[PDB]
Write a protein that binds this ligand. Structure first.
Ligand SMILES: CNS(=O)(=O)c1cccc2cnccc12
Ligand SMILES: CNS(=O)(=O)c1cccc2cnccc12
Lengths: 340, 18
C-alpha cells in the first residue's frame, strides 16, 4: 500500500539521466549579483554570499579559479561536480540555481542556507544526543541511497559539508569529489578522518567508501570527536587501517553495533555493501524508531532550529578574509572547461 | 579523556580535503 521506494527511485533516475545527458550551461552572469561576504573556503575555492540585483534573493556562490583548478589537477573533478550537481534533485542536496564562467573563474550559484554548517553547531555543543545524531544520519542514509542508485559516489562526507536549513534538516554541499562510476575507481581523495581503509591502501574502491564515511560521521556526531584522530594525517591513516575502534562509555549498545558494521575494514562485511544493500542499515536496531518516509517527506520535528536573523544575515558562519574577485582580460583555460 | 585529547589536538577546526 506504501509508495514503492524502488519505483520512486526509478522515476528519479529517469529524471536525473535527462539532465546528466543534457546539462544546463551559462544560466546567469556575474554582474547579476552583488557580492556580500565570504561564507566558507575550501582547498579549491571560496563560497560567497551574494544578492541577486533584480529579485533581491540571496544565494551562495562558489567561485573557482580556473588556473588553480588546473594546477591542482582538479579539472575533471570540477566538471564532475558541476555536471552532477546540476542533474541531482533530492530534499537534502543543496540546489544549484545557476552556473557560469568568465575569463578567470567558474561560478556555481547555490541556494543559501543561513543556518550554518553542522560542524559549527557540533563543535560548539560538543556532541549530539543519539536521537539528534540519528535524525541527521537518517537524512544521509536516504541521500546516499538516492545518489548510489544513480551510480554516484559522493566521497566527501563530513560535518563541514552539511548545512542546517530553517526547518532543521540537512543540506549536503560540496560535490567536488562526486563521480558517476559503475564499478570501481581509484582516486586518492576525501578528508583524512573520513577515508575508508581501501582508499588509503590504494585499492580500487566503490560506493562502500560512503558507508564507511557515514560511520565516521555518526561516531563524530554522537561522540563529539572522530573515531580516528591525531595531529597529522599519517597517524590518522595508521589508526584507520588498524582498524581497531573504541567507543565512548555513553554510546548505546545498538549504536556500537551499527558503527562496528559501518567501520568494517572487510568490504565483504561492511553494512551498505552486502546482499541487502542499504536495507541492512535502514533495518538496523539503532534506526528502529526512524520513520524513513516521514524523514524523506520532512514531516519529523527537527531537534534544533538555527537562529534566524536573515534573509542575508551570516551570524551562523565564521568570518573569512576577503579577497577581490579578479577577472582577467584574457580567457584562461578555455578548452579545459568548455563543457562547464 | 579522549575528549580532552581531541580538544588539545590540532585538528578541531575545519578540515580540508586532500
Ligand atoms: C559548507 N559551507 S559553505 O562552504 O559556506 C557553502 C557551500 C555551498 C553552499 C552553501 C550554501 N549556504 C551556505 C553556505 C554554503
Ligand atoms: C516512495 N516514498 S517516499 O516517501 O516518497 C520516499 C522517497 C524517496 C526515498 C524514500 C526512502 N525511504 C522511504 C520513502 C522514500
Amino acid at each position: 500500500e506504501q509508495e514503492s521506494v524502488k519505483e520512486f527511485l526509478a522515476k528519479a533516475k529517469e529524471e536525473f539521466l535527462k539532465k546528466w545527458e543534457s546539462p544546463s550551461q551559462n544560466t546567469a552572469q556575474l554582474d547579476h549579483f552583488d557580492r556580500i561576504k565570504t561564507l566558507g573556503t575550501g582547498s579549491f575555492g571560496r563560497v560567497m554570499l551574494v544578492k541577486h540585483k533584480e529579485t533581491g534573493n540571496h544565494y551562495a556562490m562558489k567561485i573557482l579559479d580556473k588556473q588553480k583548478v588546473v594546477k591542482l589537477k582538479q579539472i575533471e573533478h570540477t566538471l564532475n561536480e558541476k555536471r552532477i550537481l546540476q542533474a541531482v534533485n533530492f530534499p537534502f542536496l543543496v540546489k544549484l540555481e545557476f552556473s557560469f564562467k568568465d575569463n578567470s573563474n567558474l561560478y556555481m550559484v547555490m541556494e543559501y542556507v543561513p543556518g550554518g554548517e553542522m560542524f559549527s553547531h557540533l563543535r560548539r555543543i560538543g556532541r549530539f544526543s543519539e536521537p539528534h545524531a540519528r535524525f541527521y544520519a537518517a537524512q544521509i542514509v536516504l541521500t546516499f541511497e538516492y545518489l548510489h542508485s544513480l551510480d554516484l559516489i559522493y566521497r566527501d562526507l563530513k560535518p563541514e559539508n552539511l548545512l542546517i536549513d530553517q526547518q532543521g534538516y540537512i543540506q549536503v554541499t560540496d560535490f567536488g569529489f562526486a563521480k558517476r562510476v559503475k564499478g570501481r575507481t581509484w582516486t586518492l581523495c576525501g578528508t583524512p578522518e573520513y577515508l575508508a581503509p581501501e582508499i588509503i591502501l590504494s585499492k580500487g574502491y566503490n560506493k562502500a567508501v560512503d558507508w564507511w564515511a557515514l560511520g565516521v560521521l555518526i561516531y563524530e556526531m554522537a561522540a563529539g570527536y572522530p573515531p580516528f584522530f591525531a595531529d597529522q594525517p599519517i597517524q590518522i591513516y595508521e589508526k584507520i587501517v588498524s582498524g581497531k575502534v573504541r567507543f565512548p562509555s555513553h554510546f548505546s549498545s545498538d549504536l556500537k553495533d551499527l558503527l562496528r558494521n559501518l567501520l568494517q575494514v572487510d568490504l565483504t562485511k561492511r553494512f551498505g555493501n552486502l546482499k541487502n544493500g542499504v536495507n541492512d542499515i535502514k533495518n538496523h536496531k539503532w534506526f528502529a524508531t526512524t520513520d524513513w518516509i516521514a524523514i524523506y517527506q520532512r514531516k519529523v520535528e527537527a531537534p534544533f532550529i538555527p537562529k534566524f536573523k536573515g534573509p542575508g544575515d551570516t551570524s551562523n558562519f565564521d568570518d573569512y578574509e576577503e579577497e577581490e574577485i579578479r577577472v582577467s582580460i584574457n580567457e584562461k583555460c578555455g578548452k579545459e572547461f568548455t563543457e562547464f | 579523556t579522549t575528549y580532552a585529547d581531541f580538544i588539545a589536538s590540532g585538528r578541531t577546526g575545519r578540515r580540508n580535503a586532500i
